[model samples]
Target: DSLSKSPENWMSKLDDGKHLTEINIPGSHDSGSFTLKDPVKSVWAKTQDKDYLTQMKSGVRFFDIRGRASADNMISVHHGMVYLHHELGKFLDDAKYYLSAYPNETIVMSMKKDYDSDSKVTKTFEEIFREYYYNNPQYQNLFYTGSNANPTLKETKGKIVLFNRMGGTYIKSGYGADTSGIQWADNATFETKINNGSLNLKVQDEYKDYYDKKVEAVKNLLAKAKTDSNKDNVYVNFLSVASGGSAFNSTYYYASYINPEIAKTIKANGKARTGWLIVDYAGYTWPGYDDIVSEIIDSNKLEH
Candidate 1:
């Protein structure tokens, strides 16, 4: 079977009672920040290696996106020096293409400001989304606008669901930061909290110092999700980390170390629930990068 098939399609094989929150999914951390302006000069600026389409093709259902307001008043997928200079439109178009092609697939996006998170930055983000996406007919129809109450696959097929951490008029009601129903522990390192009745997401951002411990934590989280009774609650295990000191030990370097270890662990631990494995440098030509993703998806299968 093709591993790249939409996870929604896999879920369709199950009972009709299953909502999106009940299943395990793969995700891409910093989904669009793949290319760096100067990797030698500023390596920490880069997080992912594959572009958006490749990520989706590799079964990444969730996208962690950070956008900055450009000089032209548009939103650009940027971390620092503009990663590949792709605007917000390109990101949406890429997502839309996959959704249109696969009727059962649904894309969940977590959008926020990069460095600037104040009201001014929020307002700019709000305006740009409104003009470009909310107002545009093609983009507007592709979103899943509903409450925190989990919906069935039949309800959310072929659409993009927004978890808007940045506020906007159109992104009101349950879609706001608080009520998006996703309790995100933003950019955490060692420890984080998991809220009830929400998507409990904790990012493992510790780098260099205790790399093994960070990978272990994610594995433990996945094990817990397998046996936990709250099937409605979604959990995210971020297997990516940042640099502790300099460019020498950047995201690329750390991904090389941990991605293989993560892959091995997932391969060994079958019949586990890998809630959502959000990875960095996922589709890179690294030895175990794609294998780790396949292992996570395979863990969902009943036969261990």
Candidate 2:
């Protein structure tokens, strides 16, 4: 949770020196704790999938049962949190043990609710999440999608995912550039930079290095995650849109879309995964997509 770039960025700020803090209560059955008999044996860990690593490292958790029935359990989709719990609440030993263990960190869980309109993308994302859990039945029904699918959706109401972190394991957010673009005018690295009004090659190179490290770090991390990991019902990874566009040749589009798909080639072969990066506003623009894509392509060449 240390990646909060602004004051409002709380979800990425929950780490207590090491990994983001998260704990599940056995009695949260009433509060919305999905049970996974053997979480350590997940495709993410057992198979070491990069898709799983991306989700497991996302640093945020969405709440449930907030929106109406039409949307069902899509609580944090577009809605933003005006305020968040900054401390892990203490569980009363006598009985309120669950609340007590909740920690003091706004970074623990905070997903912007209802940010987008009620549309196909929202529904589709929910469906995708549902599919993921269905395929991985070993994990418990914890998130909004999980709660809705259960036969007793009503009896087993959903709650916000208190702690997305299953254990101390968490992947940090890092980015770099792909060395695939050449220097040019309005169409080159010069074009993108000059268009952005900064022709500083040094600054651009620095960002490129950063991105390459991110890709490598993620790949390495997934290699470790492929082992017999511990109990973690869900995994959320952090991904940033390098640039913005129509999922065409844009960097953001490819990174957010294509690269992850390609990444599966390295581990697990084709395990599905999804999560949000809480990116900068610039990264979401139409032109932004092109920039990030260029960077990603360039960054990959710097693997050594």
Candidate 3:
């Protein structure tokens, strides 16, 4: 019997017809931030202790990735101005490797252009991303490029589903945000649709200040995702925090407080869908909240 913890193939229990919006998915924010170990930078920049593969093995089905196009015409993972030790290809490789072993699973990635890039890099973020996602022979089958899709578990299995947060060249060519404006407005909680209005998005990403306010925002949105989510609408709730009122404290400082509240909230109503919980320190064990991803996975009610 399985412990129902750290389920690399947890999605196997899901019915093939299950729409993605109906599932509770755990996600990692700044998913490639594991490499920035500078004492000062680690405080603010590092989000996860484990790398993408480890997070995947621990039951995270979604990732929030930020990248800067490098001179090699590849996308390097970045946390704002800080260049993390790896590139976007590494994460894609991680997904490729993980899914090969556990073909029952799928992963959704929210990939964005991090901060402004250096002048030496020439390619647009869109171009470099296209190199990997579109032109590359290796990734064609590795990704679910459904422009506007609420795909079933069967449709996307053994693939990395792209939620395109970086936009340019053409619009409505993929899922997630559009290219015309700043992909995501700062410190905002709002809804916008894409894929020619085929998919619905409800996002809450207030990263500026106020931990308590941020906590409330997380729960309120979690509540919304649980009760209000439909086949086309995806609830993206970020649990990553940055508080100026706490004197610009580290992300982990706030995660310690925030993760517990969220875990408890999910525990109270164990079977409700909590949508995509994009988080810092996603698989990290806290005192009593040992495995948040497993707890969130349990919320799917995959038992007999």
Candidate 4:
């Protein structure tokens, strides 16, 4: 039952006919904020200990990466403190390697501008993406470009589904940038349309109180995601919370308290479709990381 040691092609069992939107995928929040050198700047933000390589091995197929521009105009992965450039590149390389090994598997990455959320900032982010990933020969062709159509796994094999959280049209109308301007609502209880009418993409952000209420809200959300009749909607469950006090208010502490209960619910249901279970501190001194991920992966096999 342990998928942590499983082969890279573990998603091969899913039917290729299932659209990318219908399948349940495991995701990480702030995928690059693992270790921070400055405690004051990253006290409440840093999440997860394992790098992207280990997260991929632990069955994380989706990444929520935040990017910021340095004084030199270099785009670097960031949450609060600036991270090493090599680490970010290594994570991208690992994703490339994983895709090559498992052609049947696809990765979804949501990249957003951290602080300066302006049109120029969005353009800079796009330029950085174009220079580092989109224009690069080794990684350019590995992205999914069909935005209006919900493509199958076979159609998007060995590809990265780039989800742009920043606004403005950066690329051509028919390119990989079609999946841009994703609308996000934090601490929401209901699903909302993206851009008020741009596409059929729907996101649900269900983060509430910190203590015990948020855990309950997550469980309820996960349960609804499993049994909901709408198969086209993409459910994103955020398993992190922030409340009073700095010590216990960190996402790391809250996710630690919530993940095991999620695992238990999945084990109870035997099959629960978690459209996109985004977590914090995944595989960071956490033992049940693979269990929660395995359950999400296995959900695609169940009849919905």
In the range 88-191, model 2's lDDT, one tens digit per residue, is 11111111221122222221232112233345344442233233321235333322232221112122122223221111111111010112121322211111
Model 1 lDDT per residue over 226-297, tens place: 676465556667787766644357777777777778777766776666676777777655642446666666
lDDT tens digits by residue: candidate 4, 1-304:
5333462555666677777677778888888877565565454667667788778877788898787754323467777445534434555777888888777888888777775523445446666665656556766677776644456777777887766665544543221244445546666766545533433554445555655677777777777777865655667777766534545466666766677677667767765666788887775546535356666666555332
> Runs in model 2 with CA error above 4 Å?
1-157, 164-209, 232-236, 241-258, 261-263, 266-304
Per-residue error for 141 in candidate 2, Å, reads: 17
Residues 147-197 of candidate 3: C-alpha lDDT, one tens digit per residue? 545778788888877777886434333355355423566797888775556
Clashing pairs in 1: none
RMSD of candidate 4 to true structure, Å? 3.9
How high is the CA lDDT of each candidate model?
A: 0.64, 0.23, 0.77, 0.65
Better of 3 and 4 by lDDT: 3
- Each model's Cα RMSD: 4.2, 20.3, 2.4, 3.9
Better of 1 and 2 by TM-score: 1
Off by over 4 Å in 3: 1-6, 146-148, 168-174, 177-183
> What's each prediction's TM-score?
0.80, 0.24, 0.91, 0.81
* C-alpha lDDT of residue 224 in model 3: 86
In model 4, which runs have C-alpha deviations exceeding 4 angstroms?
A: 1-7, 37-42, 71-73, 80-88, 117-123, 130-132, 171-180, 195-200, 206-208, 243-249, 284-290, 302-304
Question: Candidate 2, 258: how far from true, in Å?
Answer: 6.0
Q: Which scores greater on TM-score, model 1 or model 3? A: 3
Model 1: lDDT to the true structure: 0.64
Q: How many pairs of residues collide in each model? A: 0, 62, 0, 0
Error of 1 at 3 (Å): 4.0
Provide the lDDT at 282 for model 1: 70
By lDDT, the candidates rank as 3, 4, 1, 2
